[PDB]
Design a protein around this ligand. Structure first.
Ligand SMILES: *[C@@H]1O[C@H](CO)[C@@H](O[C@@H]2O[C@H](CO)[C@@H](O[C@@H]3O[C@H](CO[C@@H]4O[C@H](CO)[C@@H](O)[C@H](O[C@@H]5O[C@H](CO)[C@@H](O)[C@H](O)[C@@H]5O)[C@@H]4O)[C@@H](O)[C@H](O[C@@H]4O[C@H](CO)[C@@H](O)[C@H](O)[C@@H]4O[C@@H]4O[C@H](CO)[C@@H](O)[C@H](O)[C@@H]4O)[C@@H]3O)[C@H](O)[C@H]2NC(C)=O)[C@H](O)[C@H]1NC(C)=O
Ligand SMILES: *[C@@H]1O[C@H](CO)[C@@H](O)[C@H](O)[C@H]1NC(C)=O
Ligand SMILES: *[C@@H]1O[C@H](CO)[C@@H](O)[C@H](O)[C@H]1NC(C)=O
Lengths: 236, 97, 49, 47, 49, 50, 42
């Protein structure tokens, strides 16, 4: 099937079982997924929550978000948005496309996301999250975080970098969306470049006059989407 | 991206569906759960995701049917008086009163 | 060898080729559609090697 | 292609068809690059 | 309208006389067009006429 | 067309086949199907297709 | 050196209200690094 065994974005495979090839009679469809080349699977997302540790969380859940991992589906991440009464970042992982509830292993990322903060503030929930072909972006209640990368496993634990947004407090990050074009880049042609847009609902304060930013592939420089009554950018 | 299916969720619990590039749509049904979301896998099957509920559908076909979770295909008709009227051998008008 | 098959209008029959002695006779069969009749049904040509 | 340069998508839509069919839209992609199998070899003739 | 001559050309299709002394070298015209180094960026094809 | 705002001289197709098909009053029968009654128009063209 | 002092709530974006800079006033760095007493003047 495959002769290369690095870490890269490789598509899934569609499997057809038949009783004969040319005279196709009893067709049955299915999926086959590679494990050793999938980017996201090689890292540990965080501390594993056990059973009956997620059951008490249920009367606190407020909304559900999912990812898709554009090149190969069925390896989605499911994120919980929760009430401000409870605390923690709660993400489950699938590898079989949510066919059984027993397989969605639940993690928690509170330690990793509190590391680059210098102090715990109040309590945080995941607002939105996307999974690009080589990066993971999470807009949580306390700001925006970008994973370092997925193709170079070094510590078996995701290292998040906190994006900077001057003048942005908690009541802005709870109203903000991430937009991304779901396109698969399997063999990685040179012209293919990925973008991510973030949009807030703000008042155009003194510190920042924009409400809409976008960034290229290593999500480090976030530049405003509008340059030099005034309309609002719903989506760029 | 398989089967080119698109599904919108609208408050009051309704679910609208279409294919990509078509200029018409349909109403798959209704769903009144408090917190839920819809997911499409690689083969095209649709799953309802809820805390402690990952449902896939009662009736499953070989291909990726997108209406398995809902019970019966709903009646799209309203409540009015229809007056029918012939115009040809195989064509007919209906007036809503 | 070659055979021709026309199915019913709405049914979907699946043909099959079998060998009495598979220990000493192997085959490969290809079923391809060619033409379409006046009424609307489609002729199928299946060739066995 | 036209000349020396990307990618594009070709969409085939059956506008008349119903929304309960399994396959309606077909989306090939055409890339103005070379595949990973496009190589050139030189047989030495010795074997 | 000029093909009314009473002497037989070796080939039909009077555009053969047009595209005969230049048709040996279509590839160079194509190379000059593809890398946009020629004329007004105009590629005059040989089989379009 | 004498209509106010569009008083103008226009040329227009006259679909004779469509008019002939839209000529409605034709012999029919009250045929019994599905333990009910339907209006089935008698076939006048001797052939089905050409 | 020049010091600048504010009166803030220690928000999410910024945790300091006391900065200072050298003769080229381009890099303004906080005066105190890692209940919390407020610094009136540094
Ligand atoms: C859908 O799924 C299919 C499943 O097959 C998948 O096809 C696979 O795509 C891969 C690319 O993503 C292909 O990998 C490529 O393999 C090339 C070598 O092919 C050789 O073919 C020989 C005869 O068939 C075979 O004997 C040979 O055996 C192998 O040799 C390897 C050493 O070359 C060795 O490591 C193996 O263990 C095995 O012995 C090969 O199979 C490679 O040339 C190609 O590119 C190289 O990649 C490596 C790693 O990054 C790199 O170090 C090396 O330099 C090459 O990079 C570039 O090569 C080009 C030449 O091609 C140079 O010009 C550049 O300068 C670079 O140097 C790559 O690894 C794989 O072969 C293929 N599967 C099969 C069965 O063929 C599709 O891609 C999937 N598609 C989608 C959209 O998902
Ligand atoms: C802008 O400010 C007004 C009052 O100052 C506030 O009501 C409004 O919600 C603000 N806009 C947004 C998008 O929050
Ligand atoms: C900090 O916040 C409280 C209430 O939110 C306010 O009373 C106080 O003035 C703030 N501190 C400063 C320095 O403004």
């Amino acid at each position: 099937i495959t002769v290369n065994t690095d870490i890269a974005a490789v598509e899934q495979w569609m499997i057809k079982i038949t009783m004969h090839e040319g005279l196709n009679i009893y067709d049955t469809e299915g999926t086959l997924l590679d494990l050793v080349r999938e980017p996201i699977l090689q890292w540990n997302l965080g501390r594993v929550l056990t059973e009956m540790e997620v059951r008490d969380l249920y009367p606190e859940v407020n909304d559900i978000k999912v990812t898709k991992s554009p090149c190969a589906n069925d390896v989605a991440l499911i994120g919980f948005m929760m009430k401000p009464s409870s605390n923690g970042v709660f993400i489950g992982k699938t590898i079989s496309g949510f066919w059984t509830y027993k397989e969605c292993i639940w993690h928690d990322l509170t330690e990793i996301i509190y590391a680059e903060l210098k102090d715990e503030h109040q309590g945080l929930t995941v607002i939105d999250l996307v999974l690009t072909n080589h990066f993971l972006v999470i807009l949580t209640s306390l700001g925006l975080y970008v994973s370092s990368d997925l193709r170079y496993p070094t510590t078996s634990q995701i290292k998040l970098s906190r994006a900077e947004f001057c003048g942005f407090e908690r009541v802005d990050y709870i109203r903000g969306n991430l937009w991304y074009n779901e396109k698969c880049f399997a063999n990685r042609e040179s012209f293919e470049v990925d973008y991510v847009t973030i949009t807030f609902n703000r008042n155009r304060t003194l510190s920042e006059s924009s409400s809409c930013f976008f960034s290229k592939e290593p999500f480090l420089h976030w530049l405003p989407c509008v340059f030099s009554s005034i309309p609002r950018v719903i989506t760029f | 991206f398989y089967t080119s299916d698109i599904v919108f969720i609208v408050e009051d619990g309704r679910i609208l569906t279409t294919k990509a590039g078509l200029t018409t749509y349909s109403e798959l049904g209704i769903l009144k759960d408090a917190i839920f979301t819809l997911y499409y896998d690689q083969l095209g099957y649709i799953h309802k995701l809820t805390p402690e509920n990952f449902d896939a559908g009662s009736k499953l076909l070989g291909h990726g049917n997108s209406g398995s979770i809902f019970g019966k295909r709903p009646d799209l008709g309203f409540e009015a008086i229809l007056v029918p009227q012939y115009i040809s051998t195989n064509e007919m008008y209906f007036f809503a009163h | 060898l070659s055979a021709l098959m026309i199915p019913r209008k709405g049914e979907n029959p699946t043909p099959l080729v079998m060998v009495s002695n598979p220990h000493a006779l192997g085959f490969k069969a290809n079923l391809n559609e060619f033409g379409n009749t006046f009424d609307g049904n489609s002729k199928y040509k299946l060739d066995i090697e | 292609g036209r000349f020396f340069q990307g990618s594009t998508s070709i969409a085939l839509v059956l506008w008349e068809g119903s929304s309960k069919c399994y396959a309606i839209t077909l989306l090939p992609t055409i890339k103005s690059s070379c595949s990973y199998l496009r190589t050139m070899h030189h047989t030495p003739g010795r074997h | 309208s000029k093909y009314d001559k009473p002497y037989a050309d070796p080939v039909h299709d009077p555009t053969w006389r047009w595209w005969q002394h230049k048709t040996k070298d279509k590839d160079y015209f194509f190379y000059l067009f593809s890398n946009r180094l020629a004329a007004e960026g105009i590629y005059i094809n040989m089989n379009a006429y | 067309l004498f209509d106010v705002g569009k008083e103008r001289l226009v040329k227009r197709l006259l679909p004779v086949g469509t008019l002939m098909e839209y000529n409605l009053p034709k012999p029919f029968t009250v045929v019994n199907q599905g333990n009910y009654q339907a209006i089935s128009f008698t076939h006048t063209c001797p052939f089905k297709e050409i």
